[model samples]
Target: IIVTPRYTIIEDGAINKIEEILKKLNLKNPLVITGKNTKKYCRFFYDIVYYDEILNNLEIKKYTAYDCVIGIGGGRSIDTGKYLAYKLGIPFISVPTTASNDGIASPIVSIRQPSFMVDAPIAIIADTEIIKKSPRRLLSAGMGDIVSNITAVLDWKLAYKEKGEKYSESSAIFSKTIAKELISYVLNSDLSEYHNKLVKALVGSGIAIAIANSSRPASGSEHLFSHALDKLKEEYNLNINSLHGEQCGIGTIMMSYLHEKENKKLSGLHEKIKMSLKKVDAPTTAKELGFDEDIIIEALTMAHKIRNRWTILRDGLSREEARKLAEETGVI
Candidate 1:
């Protein structure tokens, strides 16, 4: 059975309430995990550990004194905390310093290692004030992640129809609803409530993934493309500094275009997502992501081989087809 987080708090000063929240949960002696820059935000007194310091040395005995783990930072710190909690069989409380990705509430962890599934956090305390103060690029990346959910759901539906994969209507509806809401909000609103809305949407997307018991509702062809880029970066020892959500956002544009070519109903999806990405200053092209045209084409043609999940890229793309898709979507 899928279990969602027991508590979720998103407010202007939610961090200040962590103490009371811990007390309410009867979780004393919580081990706090954070990154270097994020350590300043760990105001509440607790046993602190840097994510990098203990990541490789996860000796359970070292953390035996802690009743729970509190991840207080961006994706790395939070994922570290989640992994530690999973290992120690303790609950995890996520206090994200940025809205950069859905890892804030998802049951997935992907720091410097391969992604894996774990239990969702027992609680999620998102301080909108802190998140609002994060770099504008992080917020834009968060929007990109949320917007990519559109193509993810479309891919999930495609898998169900073409591959006879099991489908979750509730999960798909939940994901698509939040994705559309976020897109409409980005396009129509002035983004005065950017932090809160994005946090909510990302949290909702995470829940959709948990419900489906897979990343299908939140990751599809766009994510595969991003993974392919990461793989190439490692193999070639390239300095690819683009954030995951940023790459996924660009992949969404091209993947949506491919979907449009196959289904007229998806004709304008790529355009809408591209416009939303531009509205938030998220990268919608390989150039903006600091990727070369050749790299982009290579990643596109090999994206399907990254994982077995079916999507528009199931058949894989030729170099010519990949270039045309990138060019047609204005992603080159």
Candidate 2:
């Protein structure tokens, strides 16, 4: 483990434990990445020594003296903090103020660039108390990230099977268990308790990446689609964009539909994502995502080229077929 679990503290006093660790490490310089409002909101919650714009600050000068970064807000700031740490070659601690995504851990990071989704984070600080108050959008994003595991892990499994190699059962088990736990949160869990299901699921996702040293746990065909959409924004300079999760929301439902159509049987392939979105009120349809036929065709085509990796979307699944299916079912 390049990064050991210093401690997985989640509660009202989670910050105190982190402070104790920083003090023990003699970590004086800390770069704080968050929105202006989150910095203000967390003033009484944690001791922060510095601050950086959540996104688009683009100032290299601000990071000169910081020894480490503690992300204090949403996924964007957390991405900045993790990328900063990757640049600085230092440990970045994730102090998510929301239970939005598994970004707190995992082996990838998402930047504004038009390429891969990026490697995940180092160590995640899953605070149950703080996560309960996160906005519904975040919870939906977390579901988007977590739920994609189904297709991503399947991608890996299919590849391994094609290569005639034995798969790591333990790694697969770990990924699925974490995803299942998070699904429970989006479906059955009561919102009032600090059961820590969302954050724990994220932590488990980090463990999956750590064990595999790859993103097979939480990134799959949908993310490839999302990445393709991002590249569309760059390569073709297309607009009519949406958030990554929002895009994943569309991919999730469509892929589910594709699976049912191709297999003709729901069985185990049918993941309980319907209630998951309804709980969070996510935009789960193409129409709900502000898209039309051309856009869907554009996304499917670009997503196919986003990576050469094997997926159902890349298995000669032409944009024509996708568009026809989407239109026939009103997925357009």
Tens digit of per-residue lDDT, candidate 1, span 1-332: 89789899999999998988898899889999999999999986799999988867667377779999999998889998998899899999999999999999999988653588889898999999999999888999998788778889999999999999999988898998898988998899998997889999999988888889888899999998998999889988899789988999999888888889889976698899999989999998888899889999999999998887899888899999999999988988
Q: How close is candidate 2 to the true structure, as a TM-score?
A: 0.83
The TM-score leader among the candidates is 1
Per-residue lDDT tens digits of candidate 2, residues 248-319? 755665665565665655544444665665566666666676665576777776675666666656464577
Steric clash pairs (candidate 1):
none
Lowest summed lDDT across 10 adjacent residues in model 1 is found at 55-64
Pairs clashing in candidate 2?
A: 107-119, 107-120, 108-119, 108-120, 109-118, 109-119
Off by over 4 Å in 1: 112-114
- What is the overall TM-score of model 1 with all chains considered together? 0.97
RMSD of every prediction: 1.3, 3.6
